[PDB]
Design a protein around this ligand. Sequence first.
Ligand SMILES: Cc1cc2nc3c(=O)[nH]c(=O)nc-3n(C[C@H](O)[C@H](O)[C@H](O)COP(=O)(O)OP(=O)(O)OC[C@H]3O[C@@H](n4cnc5c(N)ncnc54)[C@H](O)[C@@H]3O)c2cc1C
Ligand SMILES: Cc1cc2nc3c(=O)[nH]c(=O)nc-3n(C[C@H](O)[C@H](O)[C@H](O)COP(=O)(O)OP(=O)(O)OC[C@H]3O[C@@H](n4cnc5c(N)ncnc54)[C@H](O)[C@@H]3O)c2cc1C
Ligand SMILES: Cc1cc2nc3c(=O)[nH]c(=O)nc-3n(C[C@H](O)[C@H](O)[C@H](O)COP(=O)(O)OP(=O)(O)OC[C@H]3O[C@@H](n4cnc5c(N)ncnc54)[C@H](O)[C@@H]3O)c2cc1C
Ligand SMILES: Cc1cc2nc3c(=O)[nH]c(=O)nc-3n(C[C@H](O)[C@H](O)[C@H](O)COP(=O)(O)OP(=O)(O)OC[C@H]3O[C@@H](n4cnc5c(N)ncnc54)[C@H](O)[C@@H]3O)c2cc1C
Ligand SMILES: O=c1ccn([C@H]2C[C@H](O)[C@@H](COP(=O)(O)O)O2)c(=O)[nH]1
Ligand SMILES: O=c1ccn([C@H]2C[C@H](O)[C@@H](COP(=O)(O)O)O2)c(=O)[nH]1
Ligand SMILES: O=c1ccn([C@H]2C[C@H](O)[C@@H](COP(=O)(O)O)O2)c(=O)[nH]1
Ligand SMILES: O=c1ccn([C@H]2C[C@H](O)[C@@H](COP(=O)(O)O)O2)c(=O)[nH]1
Lengths: 215, 207, 207, 207
Amino acid sequence: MEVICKHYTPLDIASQAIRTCWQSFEYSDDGGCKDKELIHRVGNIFRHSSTLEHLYYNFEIKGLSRGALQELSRHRIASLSVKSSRYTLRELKEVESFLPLNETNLERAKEFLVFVDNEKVNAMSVLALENLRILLSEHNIKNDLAKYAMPESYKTHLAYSINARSLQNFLTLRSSNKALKEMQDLAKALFDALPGEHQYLFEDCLKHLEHHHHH
Amino acid sequence: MEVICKHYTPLDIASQAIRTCWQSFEYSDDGGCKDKELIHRVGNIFRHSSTLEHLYYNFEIKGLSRGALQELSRHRIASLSVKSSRYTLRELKEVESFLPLNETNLERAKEFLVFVDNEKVNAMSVLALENLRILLSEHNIKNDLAKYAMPESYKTHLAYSINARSLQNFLTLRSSNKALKEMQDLAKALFDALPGEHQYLFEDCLK
Amino acid sequence: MEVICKHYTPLDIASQAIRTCWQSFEYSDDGGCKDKELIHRVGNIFRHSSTLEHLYYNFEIKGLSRGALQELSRHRIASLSVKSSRYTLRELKEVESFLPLNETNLERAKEFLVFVDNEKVNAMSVLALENLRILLSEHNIKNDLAKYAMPESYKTHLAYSINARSLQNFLTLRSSNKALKEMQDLAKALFDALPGEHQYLFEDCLK
Amino acid sequence: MEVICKHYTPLDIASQAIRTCWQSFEYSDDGGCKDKELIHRVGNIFRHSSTLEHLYYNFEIKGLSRGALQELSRHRIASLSVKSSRYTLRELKEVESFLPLNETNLERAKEFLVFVDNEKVNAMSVLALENLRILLSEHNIKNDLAKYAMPESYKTHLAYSINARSLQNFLTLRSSNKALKEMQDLAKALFDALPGEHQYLFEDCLK
Ligand SMILES: Cc1cc2nc3c(=O)[nH]c(=O)nc-3n(C[C@H](O)[C@H](O)[C@H](O)COP(=O)(O)OP(=O)(O)OC[C@H]3O[C@@H](n4cnc5c(N)ncnc54)[C@H](O)[C@@H]3O)c2cc1C
Ligand SMILES: Cc1cc2nc3c(=O)[nH]c(=O)nc-3n(C[C@H](O)[C@H](O)[C@H](O)COP(=O)(O)OP(=O)(O)OC[C@H]3O[C@@H](n4cnc5c(N)ncnc54)[C@H](O)[C@@H]3O)c2cc1C
Ligand SMILES: Cc1cc2nc3c(=O)[nH]c(=O)nc-3n(C[C@H](O)[C@H](O)[C@H](O)COP(=O)(O)OP(=O)(O)OC[C@H]3O[C@@H](n4cnc5c(N)ncnc54)[C@H](O)[C@@H]3O)c2cc1C
Ligand SMILES: Cc1cc2nc3c(=O)[nH]c(=O)nc-3n(C[C@H](O)[C@H](O)[C@H](O)COP(=O)(O)OP(=O)(O)OC[C@H]3O[C@@H](n4cnc5c(N)ncnc54)[C@H](O)[C@@H]3O)c2cc1C
Ligand SMILES: O=c1ccn([C@H]2C[C@H](O)[C@@H](COP(=O)(O)O)O2)c(=O)[nH]1
Ligand SMILES: O=c1ccn([C@H]2C[C@H](O)[C@@H](COP(=O)(O)O)O2)c(=O)[nH]1
Ligand SMILES: O=c1ccn([C@H]2C[C@H](O)[C@@H](COP(=O)(O)O)O2)c(=O)[nH]1
Ligand SMILES: O=c1ccn([C@H]2C[C@H](O)[C@@H](COP(=O)(O)O)O2)c(=O)[nH]1
């Protein structure tokens, strides 16, 4: 799994919005430590958390399992353009069988499958991958029908955009130890992809200081 | 699949809302044909389609594939509580093998899988189902790990709540022949599950 | 201000929804006290908050000031149909002057204005109300223009619908002492209008 | 009224998003003629219009009326941070009267009021402004109470963010001849503040 932050809204956009409520520009730093500190003090007060919505982040996500896509898509206050299995499963036509399950076929399978910490499941996923490319390549069955045999370990790719407020929500919900392992990884990857200057607005989301049982 | 409308907002909620913008209550016929056509007429003037949002429908959907869930979840202006593979895959631990593919095992497999119009794909789905069961039952692997080998054709179950405005959007987009067959079927099942008196509001959005 | 709950989703709906997640129906008592206990329990766990969304409330709000409407419409996850000033200001076309500010007039003025806890501002509102009446009655000036001289204490009427999850968020924010006094009343009024058994889902929001 | 686009998402963020769906990266020309044509073509196909949501526009709106704020706040798929009358009304505590009304005092009133195409209604606004000032100055009454005598023509200031998809919707709904004049102006203004490169994505929405 690889996550990249393709674009982000400059920090002061948020400080400029906050001061607009109280008309306290006279105390503006134009992006100085005072303004930055303001976004964190006001932006984190629930009644005024909406101020962080002005901050947007354009990410790219590679290698996420479709099973994890099921969960990512539930965060409805965000935008995504996802690789369609309906429009792209043909990618398995000109591909060699993944069986027998030898050392080099397993590695080849990783291009299309997300492996987890259990050799047997990974094996089964590859068996599902093989049967899938058999339907698509050897019997030219259409994507719309063949997709039904595809394992959720199958890899997806997506462009993902989300504002700061919704992102704190995502990180709080997914960095939690109650979330699927892969999703916890997505959460961290997202945070890490974030520009150093903005991370202070999301750090406490990985700490769970209000509900510590999540770590 | 199976869809049932467990509850819906009475039509007069929307006609009363509409008449509030203009305070045109004197024209109300108490939830009669006038108020009914008012909902459809004003509800279709784009600048006032929000008025339809007051209408809410609570559905129960049984038999939808995970692959179809993947698409349904993309309609954001809606609420849903879905059966979790992370919390319910232990349902395969003590079940009988799905192989061979005799009639009783295929019937049992249909309780867990959606079959499409291709005998080979379904055979494959049943094979993926069996491996999933084997991972869960004998190798006793935990849900968070085994769910990765689960085939998207696995059946899901969920409660689905959406308002009239978001529903028209769904029916329009998913009844299109551009949509996945299962989704087209979903749109139709959603429509057929709607109380008769309300269908006139969504009829124009179907097909 | 007056608030009325015209319709609401039955409780067992969120009850049936939560159980769909774990497929724990055998434990259900058909909306009983055990299922009712469930809604509040799981409903308060943040990762399952979404289960409260299946519950929808259809309210009618009378007498709210436009100044408060300014704040209420900022809650984006709700639906509303509001009396339009652009479309209904002629309601003043045929009304007798509100001056002098005697007591019988201060009373009539209340039919169109929200009075607060201060005689002087209320007086200014009537004067503003009177000047608005003049623009509309004597000079017959269009609504789109005359509306600019309307005091924010002018009353509005609206159909308001919102789900449990968003309502909790509302009651919590607007019942705070940090909230404009009128909004605090609105929160209390929405809570009081709720059917008996639904009120436990929102009780703590007022603390 | 003044509008400034403080920041925006580069176009290829959208073309990269679209291409991700079909994995058609090979035909990309890195935000060139091809990718631009792609946004306009795919981005306007309803089933794929969500691809435009990736473009975000950060604006600044100066001198908009509260009457207009009332309608602007109804577009819930957008973000806004608005000047608060509850926190900033004391700005009238040190201003001289606007009475008697005269070329000089009217001019001064424009600093706090939005004027319209009707001198009588503008005059009535200043009179409303004078009373609001009095409540705040002469009697030092709290903003929460005084604000009730404020005319909807009072000026506001806010930071406004919204994505391409929601913006097309807004421009279509507000540039319309059915919308209040000021909103038509805000629509035109927002569109003009956009960078030329992005205007071809909104031109058909406007007029
Ligand atoms: C550990 C874990 C376990 C889960 N288990 C299940 C499960 O078993 N079954 C299941 O179906 N889902 C499950 N989910 C999905 C989860 O319930 C939803 O993703 C979540 O409820 C959406 O809420 P959100 O806050 O993430 O909203 P987002 O959509 O990510 O963000 C929107 C925010 O806006 C508000 N909002 C948005 N839409 C609405 C609305 N329609 N009504 C009211 N407020 C709204 C909310 O306050 C929300 O926080 C689980 C998630 C986690 C992290
Ligand atoms: C035939 C078909 C093919 C598809 N192919 C792909 C594909 O290849 N890749 C892919 O990633 N997706 C694909 N999708 C997903 C689809 O693009 C999204 O589900 C859809 O765009 C979300 O828009 P909606 O109108 O369904 O919104 P819903 O979420 O169902 O409803 C919300 C409505 O509110 C508005 N709205 C909601 N959220 C926002 C927001 N964040 N910004 C602005 N306005 C908003 C919109 O006007 C929208 O119509 C496909 C869908 C269909 C029907
Ligand atoms: C005491 C008080 C003081 C206030 N002062 C000001 C002020 O000075 N200036 C001002 O402009 N406003 C002010 N407001 C308005 C307030 O900021 C908004 O009403 C509020 O931000 C809307 O947020 P919400 O959580 O109530 O969302 P709702 O719109 O009521 O509900 C939606 C929920 O979904 C989520 N959500 C919705 N939309 C988005 C989005 N676009 N991005 C991310 N998450 C989203 C949120 O988590 C939210 O809780 C004040 C409100 C109060 C109660
Ligand atoms: C000329 C004109 C006249 C008007 N007259 C009145 C009037 O008399 N009374 C009155 O009360 N209002 C009136 N309005 C307000 C208007 O009806 C609302 O602002 C509007 O309906 C909100 O819809 P939207 O498309 O602007 O949504 P936005 O909130 O701007 O954008 C969100 C988009 O997402 C979708 N969406 C968002 N929320 C929901 C939801 N809860 N359910 C379903 N889909 C959703 C929609 O497709 C919508 O287009 C008027 C507006 C105009 C332009
Ligand atoms: O950690 C979780 C568990 C469930 N879900 C939601 C989204 C899917 O629609 C459904 C998936 O359930 P699982 O297959 O992840 O168990 O419920 C999540 O978003 N995150
Ligand atoms: O008809 C479609 C095609 C794609 N998608 C969206 C939602 C999923 O996140 C992803 C699924 O692509 P498919 O697996 O359906 O091809 O894109 C749909 O909703 N409907
Ligand atoms: O308690 C408050 C204070 C401000 N606002 C938002 C919504 C309006 O757009 C604007 C109103 O500022 P006031 O007129 O309430 O001061 O900011 C609220 O919603 N609630
Ligand atoms: O052109 C209009 C007419 C009405 N409204 C909505 C939003 C406000 O809540 C209420 C305002 O009615 P007017 O004051 O604009 O007449 O209805 C608009 O957004 N735009």
